[PDB]
Design a protein around this nucleic acid. Structure first.
Ligand SMILES: [K+]
Ligand SMILES: [K+]
Ligand SMILES: [K+]
Ligand SMILES: [K+]
Ligand SMILES: [Mg+2]
Ligand SMILES: [Mg+2]
Ligand SMILES: [Mg+2]
Ligand SMILES: [Mg+2]
Ligand SMILES: [Mg+2]
Ligand SMILES: [Mg+2]
Ligand SMILES: [Mg+2]
Ligand SMILES: [Mg+2]
Ligand SMILES: [Mg+2]
Ligand SMILES: [Mg+2]
Ligand SMILES: [Mg+2]
Ligand SMILES: [Mg+2]
Ligand SMILES: [Mg+2]
Ligand SMILES: [Mg+2]
Ligand SMILES: [Mg+2]
Ligand SMILES: [Mg+2]
Ligand SMILES: [Mg+2]
Ligand SMILES: [Mg+2]
Ligand SMILES: [Mg+2]
Ligand SMILES: [Mg+2]
Ligand SMILES: [Mg+2]
Ligand SMILES: [Mg+2]
Ligand SMILES: [Zn+2]
Ligand SMILES: [Zn+2]
Lengths: 127, 91, 212, 97, 63, 202, 25, 97
RNA sequence: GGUGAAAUUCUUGGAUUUAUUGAAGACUAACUACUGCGAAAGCAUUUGCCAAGGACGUUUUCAUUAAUCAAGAACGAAAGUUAGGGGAUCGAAGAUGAUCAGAUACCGUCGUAGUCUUAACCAUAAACUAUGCCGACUAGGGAUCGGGUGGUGUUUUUUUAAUGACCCACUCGGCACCUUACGAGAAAUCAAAGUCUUUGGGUUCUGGGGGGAGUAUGGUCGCAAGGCUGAAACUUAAAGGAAUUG
RNA sequence: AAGAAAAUGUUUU
């Protein structure tokens, strides 16, 4: 009796995407990012920004007719991090608290069976 | 006896045109004048006519090939690509 | 100011003819118009749904099923099997140190016309009395086990249609067949058919789709 | 002198080991030398397990875990305190904490 | 402004660079079966009740 | 003569009259005498066959590709060249292809091409090494050789002519809108100088 | 000076010396 | 493999090498099997297959060309087709299909 | 997007994100270890083919055929060179944004050569275990890889038995490890770096204070970059190793 | 999860 979408939280460092789509993913519903919910250029990835983004996404989802979401959490993946950003957890929590129902949380971080050369040189980023 | 140290077939050019150009020419002249294995009769009798035409002195079969070698690496890769695409199409 | 959701209408995804439950959910699309058919924007969509949601049983929490919309029948998107894959958490939980991971994959045509790649996985395990702490296979065991798994997968396809293979995957009978055929080589705790990939579909055959 | 009996790596009888890239800085380090830690973090702990369970549509969902093997170069591992400089005698202790 | 009050049931410890902030496990006065961890500036003790302009924002330590 | 690629004479039966029709294809590499060539919508994906562009899968290598259906071959005809099929648009039937120059072109899906690459590739890898070899090359193509440099002429003969030193005098990059007699040098050049950087601009 | 860059400098010096030697005849 | 069976036949059994002697053996009915190289021309292969079906003779298609077939039969010349007249102490006639 | 923070950059021709397809080249995650193989460099997706190899087992065979090796050879990471191919990614140069006193450095965004391959060159690395190779002997111990032997063994079924996996004991060979060092060492440490002033099992190579200098010169190899061989004048009282306390 | 800048100091006791 629930209308299901997909949450598609892309939690990188430097940003968080809360992207609710249909079950197919072709049609999207209220893609909201923390960069539009804060304006500092450094809090883009903050859990506060992610929570505000997820609140807005859940509001628009409940106005469209989406009542439950299957969750897909991802990091940047590929060759870059594989660790979800600081805002993914807060986005998932805010989606839970905003009245949306939750189903089937899964990690879809793209993981190579092996990859192209990682960025940074063999001596790495030297800071 | 070995008559030249390195010029090989390009000893016909004497001291002219530059050693690098003579070397580059030498590689492709050796390729274009070599005898190749015939894929039809199994003999080492395929020689070039004009560029891109490779004829077997035995079994008289001629195949279109590279300018200076019977089969270019590009053509072999294309043959493999076409084989893969055809196998997908038919199965 | 455009409100794209006012011109969108909903369709109900009817995935199986056989799984347990036809209703997997709803999707939305722009209203059919002069130059952009709604059925055109549909009919290529793939929905990935948990096999637990398809069967009603939580012991299928892994093994998501892909179902692609093949026909639109009066606000009903009838789909068909498009592929199956384990969940990332399940695969990562299965992959542990101090054991051998054995992977096999075959490309085989189903009995009707479908071309599929089957990916099966297995892991060596310790015996019940084992004191040694890793229980590795000897890679000739691995070659033999991979051969056996390849034969089993190739025989289970080519003797079944896509629908019959789908109905065979759900009870995991192929897992048990692999276990019985490999138990005399190495124990192989965690046999699974981890992936089915659809490489080429035959002619659409709406007649064959209309089994639901 | 020689700081470590074997070497600062684990390679005896090998000769060459393929490298991995540090997850923190991307420095190339031989796989045997890299400091490797596995992370099995619950997909949502966040002090939010009960709240996600309440929002869930399934009873007793058994929420999944995220598994990630992290490879650190020596510099990054020391700086982020995955590993710490130890006394000369404590260096010889290969047991984990 | 939405109303929510809470009460320290445990004082975890000091945090912040200068040690001016204190972490408190706080239990909401309404719906007392739920606890969140907050950062409070001034002096706090046990069973002392705070007002939270924002309700649900898990405080982490302050490096 | 005058063409690097070899040609294949291919004999077909005339479907409407009892006779043979000889065609001059450009031989694709690997095509041999006595080989059966299949041309049509239903032909197989074998080297030397002539298929409509819409009947081949993505990534197919074709040659002597028609720009329009029935022009009998316009694209990828020089030795070693080929066209790559990079995609189809079945509705409003078109095929997207990559040309030897790297250009992307949209062609009718009914345009035909020969599976494979034009034979004779690698031809330009051998130095000509000799004015005489250039002479014999162009003796069978056209009277475009040898070339006198414009700066070596007099002002009457060429824009670049004249001067107490050999020099162009003004920019050799010439406007696209310049007129005949002015278009000597680098016509409508977007840039000049030793090409440093990447191709296939996005 | 780092021994690697001393090596580099010495190689450059050797090349320059050879060039001047060959310029003489 | 089949190379070992062929070598055993060459060492112990009876055989003829070449198209003319193979066709003679087929028409005389004393051929037990004919092995045709992969690169044998298709017209000759079809003719040998027709002769073999007329004589109820088994046909094996050697994967390699005449060069490889000659090497397999232990000769320093190319062989397009081998005719086995007597298998010798070798199971080449029974270990097929 | 990116960063500590930015900016360069892309973006209502819809960027980033999402879905379905497709292509290209590279790589071969997790499994992956104080584990394996190889002369070393190295070698990790499947299957097939081709030859090769160690160890073990052997009441098989030959019978000193052996060890180490100037001269002379084979292989030899990476980068680099030449010519085709390929050129996804990353990326010497370069372009660029930032930082900065300067910052053509670190950081950021691009990006040529290169990275891959083929056919040839090059022959060098902290090419490291900074420990030549062959042989013998001298402590204790537990693991582990490969082979073999044994067991009233556990489990797996085929129908008595038997393979496989495992357990226990033993053994040969291997990568290693732990403890103690009789002993060795300047010490760090070392089962060899021990069996050395109680100094001799065989043998190859190398060093003779620090620089000048791996330079000059000659030779030789290389297309080149360079490699191999390789001084002296002159200069200098230390340079250096290990450890101790600050 | 992580957290900007910091160059220099004459000779002999
Ligand atoms: K950011
Ligand atoms: K002039
Ligand atoms: K490139
Ligand atoms: K003094
Ligand atoms: Mg640092
Ligand atoms: Mg700094
Ligand atoms: Mg030190
Ligand atoms: Mg090495
Ligand atoms: Mg010219
Ligand atoms: Mg001229
Ligand atoms: Mg004049
Ligand atoms: Mg004029
Ligand atoms: Mg002018
Ligand atoms: Mg003049
Ligand atoms: Mg941003
Ligand atoms: Mg192994
Ligand atoms: Mg793998
Ligand atoms: Mg020597
Ligand atoms: Mg600057
Ligand atoms: Mg880049
Ligand atoms: Mg290279
Ligand atoms: Mg050296
Ligand atoms: Mg050394
Ligand atoms: Mg000295
Ligand atoms: Mg010291
Ligand atoms: Mg001072
Ligand atoms: Zn021939
Ligand atoms: Zn690092």
């Amino acid at each position: 009796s629930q209308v299901f979408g997909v949450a598609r939280i892309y939690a990188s460092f430097n940003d968080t995407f809360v992207h609710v789509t249909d079950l197919s993913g072709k049609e999207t519903i209220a893609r909201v990012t923390g960069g539009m919910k804060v304006k500092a250029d450094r809090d883009e990835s903050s859990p506060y920004a992610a929570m505000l983004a997820a609140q807005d996404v859940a509001a628009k989802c409940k106005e469209v007719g989406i009542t439950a979401v299957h969750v897909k959490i991802r990091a940047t993946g590929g060759t870059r991090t594989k660790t979800p950003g600081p805002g993914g957890q807060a986005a998932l929590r805010a989606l839970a608290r905003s009245g949306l129902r939750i189903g089937r949380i899964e990690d879809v971080t793209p993981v190579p069976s092996d990859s192209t050369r990682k960025k940074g040189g063999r001596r790495g980023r030297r800071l | 006896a070995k008559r030249t140290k390195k010029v090989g077939i390009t000893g016909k050019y004497g001291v002219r045109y530059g050693s690098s150009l003579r070397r580059q020419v030498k590689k492709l002249e050796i390729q274009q004048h070599a005898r190749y294995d015939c894929s039809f009769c199994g003999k080492k009798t395929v020689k070039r006519g004009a560029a891109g035409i490779w004829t077997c002195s035995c079994c008289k079969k001629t195949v279109a090939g590279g300018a200076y070698t019977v089969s270019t690496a590009a053509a072999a890769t294309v043959r493999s690509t076409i084989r893969r695409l055809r196998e997908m199409v038919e199965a | 100011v455009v409100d794209p959701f006012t011109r969108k209408e909903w369709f109900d995804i009817k995935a199986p003819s056989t799984f347990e439950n036809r209703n997997v959910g709803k999707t939305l699309v722009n209203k059919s118009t002069g130059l952009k058919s709604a059925s055109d924007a549909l009919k290529g969509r793939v929905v990935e749904v948990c096999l637990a949601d398809l069967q009603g049983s939580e012991d299928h929490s892994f093994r998501k099923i892909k179902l692609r919309v093949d026909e639109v029948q009066g606000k009903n998107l009838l789909t068909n099997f498009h592929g199956m894959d384990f969940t990332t958490d399940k695969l990562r939980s299965m992959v542990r140190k101090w054991q051998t991971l054995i992977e096999a994959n075959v490309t085989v045509k189903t009995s009707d016309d479908y071309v599929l790649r089957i990916f099966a996985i297995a892991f060596t395990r310790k015996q019940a009395n084992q004191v040694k702490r890793h229980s590795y296979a000897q890679s000739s065991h691995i070659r033999a086990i991979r051969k056996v798994i390849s034969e089993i997968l190739t025989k289970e396809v080519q003797g079944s249609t896509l629908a019959q293979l789908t109905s065979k995957l759900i009870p995991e009978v192929i897992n048990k067949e692999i276990e019985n055929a490999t138990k005399d080589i190495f124990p192989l705790q965690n046999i699974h058919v981890r992936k089915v990939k659809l490489l080429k579909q035959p002619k659409f055959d709406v007649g064959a789709l209309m089994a639901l | 002198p020689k700081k470590r009996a074997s070497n600062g790596r684990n390679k005896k009888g090998r000769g060459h080991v393929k490298p991995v890239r540090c997850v923190n800085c991307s420095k190339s380090i031989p796989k045997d030398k890299a400091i490797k830690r596995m992370a099995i973090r619950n997909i949502v702990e966040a002090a939010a397990v009960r709240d996600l369970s309440e929002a869930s549509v399934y009873p007793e969902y058994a929420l999944p875990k995220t598994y990630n093997k992290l490879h650190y170069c020596v510099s990054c591992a020391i700086h982020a305190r995955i590993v710490r400089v130890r006394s000369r005698e404590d260096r010889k202790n290969r047991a984990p904490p | 402004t939405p109303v929510t009050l809470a009460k320290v049931i445990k004082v975890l410890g000091r945090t912040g660079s200068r040690g001016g902030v204190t972490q408190v496990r706080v239990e909401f006065l309404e719906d007392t079966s739920r606890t969140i961890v907050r950062n409070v500036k001034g002096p706090v003790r046990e069973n002392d009740i705070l007002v939270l302009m924002e309700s649900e924002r898990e405080a982490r330590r302050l490096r | 003569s005058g063409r690097g690629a070899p040609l294949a004479k291919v004999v077909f039966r005339d479907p409407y009259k009892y006779r043979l029709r000889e065609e001059i294809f450009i031989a694709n590499e690997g095509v041999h005498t006595g080989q059966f060539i299949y041309a049509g919508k239903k032909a197989s994906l074998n080297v030397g066959n002539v298929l409509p562009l819409g009947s081949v899968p993505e990534g197919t290598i074709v040659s002597n590709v028609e720009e329009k259906p029935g022009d009998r071959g316009a694209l990828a005809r020089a030795s070693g060249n080929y066209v790559i099929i990079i995609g189809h648009n079945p509705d409003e039937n078109k095929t997207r292809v990559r040309l030897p120059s790297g250009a992307k072109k949209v062609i009718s899906s009914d345009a035909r091409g020969v599976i494979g690459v034009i034979a004779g590739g690698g031809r330009v890898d051998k130095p000509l090494l000799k004015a005489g070899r250039a002479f014999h090359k162009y003796r069978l193509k056209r009277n475009s050789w040898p070339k006198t440099r414009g700066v070596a002429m007099n002002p009457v003969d060429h824009p670049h002519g004249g001067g107490n030193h050999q020099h162009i005098g003004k920019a050799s990059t010439i406007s696209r809108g310049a007129v005949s007699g002015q278009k000597a040098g680098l016509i409508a050049a977007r840039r000049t100088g030793l090409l440093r950087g990447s191709q296939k601009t996005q | 000076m780092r021994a690697k860059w001393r090596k580099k400098r010495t190689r450059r010096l050797k090349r320059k010396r050879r060039k001047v030697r060959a310029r003489s005849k | 493999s089949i190379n070992q069976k062929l070598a055993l036949v060459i060492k112990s059994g009876k055989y003829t090498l070449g198209y003319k002697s193979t066709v003679k053996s087929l028409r005389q009915g004393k051929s037990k099997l004919i092995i045709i190289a992969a690169n044998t021309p298709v017209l000759r292969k079809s003719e040998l297959e027709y002769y073999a079906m007329l004589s109820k003779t088994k046909v094996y298609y050697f994967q390699g060309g005449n060069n490889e077939l000659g090497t397999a039969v232990g000769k320093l010349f190319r062989v397009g087709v081998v005719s086995i007249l007597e298998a010798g102490d070798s199971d080449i006639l029974t270990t097929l299909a």
